[PDB]
Design a binder for this molecule. Structure first.
Ligand SMILES: C[S@@+](CC[C@H](N)C(=O)[O-])C[C@H]1O[C@@H](n2cnc3c(N)ncnc32)[C@H](O)[C@@H]1O
Length: 245
């Protein structure tokens, strides 16, 4: 996970999503005030953080591991006239710089997988006020059994990938009222995640054409689309919205 970041820092989104998905997740939380405190964990370049910026009031704080991403985050915050309430800082997902019950809303798209769904649900709770909301998108199964090929890919990539019923079950455990959940539209993958990867494929494939590692990675990125186009009926990203009791 080194040069890879120099690939993703180009893209406007490092994970599947769309302005519609973020906006729909927002429709399930309570209205916020300019004095609210928001946190987008695993924000990345901040592609979805800015969408969220137009959908809710409050001070948003994006947190990512890689400083190169955070660097672009603020770059965009300033180019959007909202550097005042939209600020990105480098940090970790398993050790957040938040006081207990300081946050009104915890956001996270295609990043919870880094520390485990259940673990994140419980560990992040601490930082949320009573009645506060948490909204995260996560890859999940849509059926009870799927094809071998696709099953392998995930069980190896992310072992905690479970069916939707199981995730919601983990939400109650962590003390969350399972407000809602919805599968992410197919365009979130193809239009907003894959299609943009073609805009920067050639410029890239040139700089690393002779590198074995870089090639196996590129083939990996192309293998994901192949898998999605072939098993878009068995898995995908699911948005989970809950309210801390
Ligand atoms: C799939 S990307 C999604 C980025 C952004 N949420 C989006 O949807 O466009 C995963 C993000 O999690 C970040 N990340 C990985 N490990 C992390 C950690 N330990 N703490 C915080 N962020 C982390 C990665 O750097 C990356 O920005």
């Amino acid at each position: 996970f080194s040069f890879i970041c120099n690939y993703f820092k180009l893209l406007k989104r490092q994970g599947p999503g769309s302005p519609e998905a973020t906006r729909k997740a927002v429709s399930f939380i309570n209205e916020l005030t300019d004095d609210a405190k928001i946190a987008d964990i695993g924000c990345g370049t901040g592609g979805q953080t800015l969408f969220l910026a137009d959908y809710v009031k409050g001070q948003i704080t994006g947190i990512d591991l890689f400083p190169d991403f955070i660097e672009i985050f603020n770059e965009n915050a300033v180019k959007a006239n909202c550097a005042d309430r939209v600020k990105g800082i480098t940090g970790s997902m398993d050790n957040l710089p938040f006081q207990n019950e300081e946050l009104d809303l915890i956001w996270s798209e295609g990043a919870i997988y880094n520390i485990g769904f259940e673990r994140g649900m419980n560990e992040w709770s601490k930082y949320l006020k009573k009645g506060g909301f948490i909204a995260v998108s996560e890859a999940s199964w849509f059926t009870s059994e799927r094809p071998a090929e696709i099953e392998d890919f995930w069980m190896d990539a992310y072992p905690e990938i479970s069916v939707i019923p199981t995730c919601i079950d983990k939400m109650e455990r962590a003390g969350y009222t399972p407000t809602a959940h919805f599968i992410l539209p197919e365009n979130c993958w193809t239009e907003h995640y894959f299609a943009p990867q073609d805009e920067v494929r050639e410029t890239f494939m040139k700089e690393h054409a002779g590198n074995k590692t870089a090639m196996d990675f590129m083939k990996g990125q192309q293998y994901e689309r192949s898998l999605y186009s072939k098993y878009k009926d068995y898995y995908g990203y699911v948005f989970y919205i809950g309210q801390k009791r």
